[PDB]
Amino acid sequence: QFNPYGDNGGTILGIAGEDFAVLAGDTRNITDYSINSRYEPKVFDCGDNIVMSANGFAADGDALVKRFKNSVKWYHFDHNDKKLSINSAARNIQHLLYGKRFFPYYVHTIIAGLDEDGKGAVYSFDPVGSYEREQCRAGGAAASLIMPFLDNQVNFKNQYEPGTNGKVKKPLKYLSVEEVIKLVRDSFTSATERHIQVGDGLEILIVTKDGVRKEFYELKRD
């Protein structure tokens, strides 16, 4: 029997800062126990200061990104070159995904950018289009390895102030772009150590009011 779905592995991570946002993902593409590519870009600049990644089954992932990029193009044509806001992009993606409710895009989608007040924004989608704005979201193979670490180190969960013994929580102080990138790199380094589908390279896209910037880092190739 023909199985229309597959699993190309990969892991992605979106974090929203105070006036910035990052969307990172490893560059390894796989089937079963084989490596297809050590560098296959997974996070894409879609225009209008929006970055996107559709992790999971790479064919559906590529199709969805392609269709969203196309939606941005036609949004400009139809509405006098108006900038597509991150919240509007998110709602649009829901309809793209739910359109195939009964033959879904087998992907976990994340987008990142800035909201209309200039603050950092990350949106997270399931395969059939349910979505939510979030501060922190890992997706894909090693998501279960990364999220608990982020709960502890970004939101300071289970951390209290010394001397008070559980009475006062550690205050939620804002993180800089340099601080976030450190946590992203350590998340993927740790994921690479313990998950076989994670490795080769890490590509991070950083979104600010100035535009989209890229950073690449080597990961272990075993």
Partner: protein, 233 residues
């Protein structure tokens, strides 16, 4: 939904400093029966592209006709059909990739794995993969089926990353490809000794080599091997 009937095995390929190399054997298997011994599975499109196909042969022959039709169609009302508006490897791939994904999305796939190898207008090497699921990926080395498991490890020792491509000559690349084909003949039960090899170079163009054979094989050591454990005679 179907099942493949007459099938072709591994297609292997890699980038080198001035272009790309691609190779595939000339066998059309019918299950374990090695039925057809003169099947060409590398199909050139113009003078800048070679499409290598594995999997179902009837679907290969269909894809072959689509590419033939693509060349005809591109020439229509096109004075620059043999110049600026000729078919690029990137155009040919994107078309195939569209077809493959559409077909899987109708639950009626073309049961193939395809590698498009070529050189672009600006001299850039093109090497990308697509299969029956519509999955696509690029790499300095690419291979299908058994080639993925056995050829890639060998080819990756020559070009391990992007920066190794300018350091790799056509002689070294062809040598590595030919050796991989020998290894596949040793170890793939659905392979044959006869194969085809194509080189697409930005300077010397498309060189298509037919009727190649696996040679320099090691078998002599077999004479000393006796029994399965305790037997001496």
């Amino acid at each position: 939904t179907q099942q493949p009937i007459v099938t072709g095995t591994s297609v292997i390929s890699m980038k080198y400093d001035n272009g790309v190399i691609i190779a595939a054997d000339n066998l059309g298997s019918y299950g374990s029966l090695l039925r057809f011994n003169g099947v060409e599975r590398l199909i050139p499109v113009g003078d800048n592209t070679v499409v290598g196909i594995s999997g179902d042969i009837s679907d290969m022959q269909h894809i072959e006709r689509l590419l033939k039709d693509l060349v005809t169609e591109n020439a229509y009302d096109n004075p620059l059909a043999d110049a600026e508006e000729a078919l690029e490897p990137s155009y040919i791939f994107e078309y195939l990739a569209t077809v493959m994904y559409q077909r899987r999305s109708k639950m009626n796939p073309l049961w193939n794995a395809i590698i498009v190898a070529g050189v672009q207008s600006n001299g850039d090497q093109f090497l990308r993969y697509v299969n029956l699921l519509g999955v696509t990926y690029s790499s300095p080395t690419l291979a299908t089926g058994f080639g993925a498991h056995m050829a890639n490890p060998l080819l990756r020792k020559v070009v391990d990353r992007e920066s190794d491509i300018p350091k790799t000559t056509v002689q070294v690349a062809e040598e590595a490809i030919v050796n991989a084909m020998r290894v596949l003949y040793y170890r793939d039960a659905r392979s044959s000794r006869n194969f085809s090899l194509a080189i697409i170079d930005k300077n010397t163009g498309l060189t298509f080599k037919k009727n190649l054979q696996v040679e320099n094989m090691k078998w002599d050591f077999a004479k000393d091997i006796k029994g399965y454990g305790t037997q001496k005679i």
